[PDB]
Amino acid sequence: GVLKIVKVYLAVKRRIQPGDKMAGRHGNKGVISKINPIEDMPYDENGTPVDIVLNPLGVPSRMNIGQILETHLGMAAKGIGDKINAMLKQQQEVAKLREFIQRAYDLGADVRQKVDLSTFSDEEVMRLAENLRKGMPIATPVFDGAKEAEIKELLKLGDLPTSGQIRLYDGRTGEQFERPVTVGYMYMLKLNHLVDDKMHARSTGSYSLVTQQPLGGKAQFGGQRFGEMEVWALEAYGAAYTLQEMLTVKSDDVNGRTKMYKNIVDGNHQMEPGMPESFNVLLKEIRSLGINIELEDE
Amino acid sequence: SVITVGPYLRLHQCGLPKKMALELFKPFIYGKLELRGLATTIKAAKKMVEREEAVVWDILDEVIREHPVLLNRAPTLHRLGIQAFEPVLIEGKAIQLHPLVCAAYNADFDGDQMAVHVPLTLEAQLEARALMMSTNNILSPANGEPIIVPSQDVVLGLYYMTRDCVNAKGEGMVLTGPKEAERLYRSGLASLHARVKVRITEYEKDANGELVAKTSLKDTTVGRAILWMIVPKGLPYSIVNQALGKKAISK
Amino acid sequence: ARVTVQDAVEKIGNRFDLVLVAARRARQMQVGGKDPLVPEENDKTTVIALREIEEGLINNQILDVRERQEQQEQEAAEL
């Protein structure tokens, strides 16, 4: 029967928006509430505003403290790239950088790796320098990583506070805050969990077949189920009419849903019940099991 | 929806991605357009909806006024795992909410979700507004404590303010009231966590529910002095005479 | 009166009573089209129900009296 088929592929992009989850590598989850204009950024003496703000409350309970050291280093490493980037725009010389850099390599205490520059030729220097201006990268072996002395020897060379914490000024008011704040860089990640593929609304559409009931799934325009404990809630409140509503008309009663549709489009906000389909369905099934269930009508 | 905060919001308010309500408040506005007759018939209503006329949104704001709404996280373990707020609209796909009620939900802004239902009938509308309006329910019915305890940051900034160094500056002067201390602090002249003399004028309903006015002095922190300003007219200053543990805020 | 449903229960004595009678009244206003008494102020019928209940104008008793008198007079004028 299949005589021929076509198929198609699209291309779609998506850009950032509040609700799109975000995280790094440390448990460091979080969710977004806002994007911020740049003028509103708190910022520095040198007017470089910031990229992210964080709430320092929770760490001493969750204690992903490596994210701190990472931060120190993250401010640190790029600073050298800036030394060099100026030296490039200022357009200094080979030998200056050569000293600067092999010095920088052979810095830590007892490092396993050992390297030379003079082995290499010039444009190699040029292009690795082109590659490092944004910041020199580093490897922390997770257990035999470096040590704080080699964070601090290093923030020194970057010519920063070894405390890594600065007087900053307010985007809204320009004035200084009370005390300093730690600053630096960490390497962050965004996720599959994203509101666009997640959220959903359902006004009115398809229904089930045996039970005439709304469906589930955004792919088929899914109504949201309520567990019965959500019903126990208004048991404890006593909302008989909302109870009635959500029992009958939004779900099962055909005459009821229709009635309500047309009454609202009339402006009329008034209720009418029926009785759930599932009830009679049961009664029939019961009777198929072969007993005379029956209703003692008034 | 995914759920985010509304910090600036008020108790009754809830952020609301408008297209959600758009989808949800369809027959309202259709009846409203047959009432106006711009969309005389209903197919016209559809393709006009489809045009995105500004009147669509004008009308939608018009309707959404005073049309209360439900709020659902799962697990709705106890009664307060759902609430009922007033709508407010937003330019985004991210519901906002009043933050303090993560408590009842035990919720947190890390990937949680929530869902909504509609008070169609007026009976439900009014049930909602009288019962699950957040004003209604703020003590647990199980035990008599507030459930809107200020959580982590607020309490801490509070503890910072209402505080008594000896160190910073501006010690042992006199004021008439907290306003000029604000003039200082917002002009940036005095320490705020700094015990200093000033007058206050508090109240008390010692008579038969009738306030009892009088003023006098206290050598109090500047912060505590300022923080008096919000007090609603019944209360001592001794109550505000400490750095205010979270338990303090509760009491 | 908007965010607070407090005064309405010290007047009557019950949440259930105020909610029921209010839904009744503003159904006679939503679809029936009777006028208000307290000013309108551009808000859906819910507020006006709450407010009318808050001053001592409408209650299930007074609704009963009004509908009683008008329907009795209707039966009278029909003959």
Binding site: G238, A239, A240, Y241 | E127 | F16, L20
Partner: peptide
């Protein structure tokens, strides 16, 4: 038969009482 529909249900109660 309680809370909200308490009133309506007790109406039904004294209706059955009243036949």
């Amino acid at each position: 038969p309680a809370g909200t529909g308490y009133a309506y249900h007790q109406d039904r109660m004294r209706r059955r009482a009243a036949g």
